[PDB]
Amino acid sequence: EVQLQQSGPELVKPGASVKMSCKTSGYTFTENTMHWVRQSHGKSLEWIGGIYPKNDDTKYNQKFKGKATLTVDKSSSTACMELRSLTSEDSAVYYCARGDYENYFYAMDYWGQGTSVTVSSAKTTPPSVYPLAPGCGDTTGSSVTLGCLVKGYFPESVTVTWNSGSLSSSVHTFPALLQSGLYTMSSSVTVPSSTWPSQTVTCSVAHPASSTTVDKKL
């Protein structure tokens, strides 16, 4: 069984470098080659480069000639990749894949864990969430929805719960966007109008990075 294990994501200051290494197992390393693929946002794929550790010889993309640097260690059967001069748009997902037998063709069967990189100049901020509830005095229609806006939090992501996890049916998880160096997301739940506003409801969010939890009444 061929298995390639990667490392964990890291936080890099723009302008510094990064060390990416993923070990290989389940086969013989030096007879085959290695490749790298970058997945840019939102959805795209691009071939970073490859290394065949018999010489060692390599080939890179025309744009990565002055950035990506690859090296290999055959003692621990691992493959390394170095990236320098990181910019704001350099945040992406990298893969560890094994190529053909002394060949770069013959499309690769197995891929990496998908370890990504995070490069930004902004520090961690506690999430600021506020209750949003009706209203002008009437609720239309018979099925009314609620929600709470989670904004001003770093980094992705935050964990949100509804009524201490009592109702898991109507919970909806909305992704965020990138503006002003911060992140803004939301969530939506639907409750019948018969129980509103008789039964209590709340919005609870937890941020694992800064260990900040905020409880509030809608």
Partner: protein, 213 residues
């Protein structure tokens, strides 16, 4: 430089039908093409290589074809485990330029989306920020948009739109739209409107409210 794209942008095929997807290349490789299956939060794997032979773990439902600069992938039939996206591969020359990607969905009966707009709370008013949001949920198909008219005037830019992937239970989508606005704009303006334009409604559904009402 070698360059290629797919067509069309996205497809919707239920379980038990035939999927026809193609990716056209500018130059002619004559030989090699590959297809990858990438789900949400997981890495791709090899399916069909060299436009003909299929890799391990792939059933007989996936079959490739095509010659020259015209290639295709025939899926008969589709199963509930095939959800994801597809890519294309070219071994012709270095560097390799991959495909643009195509998203798959499941065809079903159309559903009218629910829409509501809510006023901001009183805690945000003293924090310096203010925002109004418009909730849309349980719709189909994928093509819909939203705009903001404040007293009959468009607000661009600064309208954020977030999208949600395919849901496992009822097989639908969801979104959220939040309008960013300052303190001065909230005081001199009253009516805040958001509209949902959907193919199953001949007129945009409008939800509105007022500050003094």
């Amino acid at each position: 430089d070698i360059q290629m794209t797919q067509s069309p942008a996205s497809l919707s095929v239920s379980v038990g039908e035939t999927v026809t997807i193609t990716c056209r290349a500018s130059e002619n490789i004559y030989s090699n093409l590959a297809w990858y299956q990438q789900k949400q939060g997981k890495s791709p794997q090899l399916l069909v290589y060299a436009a003909t032979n299929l890799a391990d773990g792939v059933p007989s439902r996936f079959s490739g074809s095509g010659s020259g600069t015209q290639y295709s992938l025939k899926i008969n039939s589709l199963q509930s485990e095939d959800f994801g996206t597809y890519y294309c591969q070219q071994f012709w020359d270095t560097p390799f330029t991959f495909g643009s990607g195509t998203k798959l969905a499941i065809k079903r009966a159309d559903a009218a989306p629910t829409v509501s707009i809510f006023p901001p709370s009183s805690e945000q008013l003293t924090s310096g920020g203010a925002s109004v949001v418009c909730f849309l949920n349980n719709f189909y198909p994928k093509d819909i948009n939203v705009k903001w008219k404040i007293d009959g005037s468009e607000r661009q830019n600064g309208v954020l739109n977030s999208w949600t992937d395919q849901d496992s239970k009822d097989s639908t989508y969801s979104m959220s739209s939040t309008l960013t606005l300052t303190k001065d704009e909230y005081e001199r303006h009253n009516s805040y409107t958001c509209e949902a334009t959907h193919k199953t409604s001949t007129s945009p559904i409008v939800k509105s409210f007022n500050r003094n009402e």
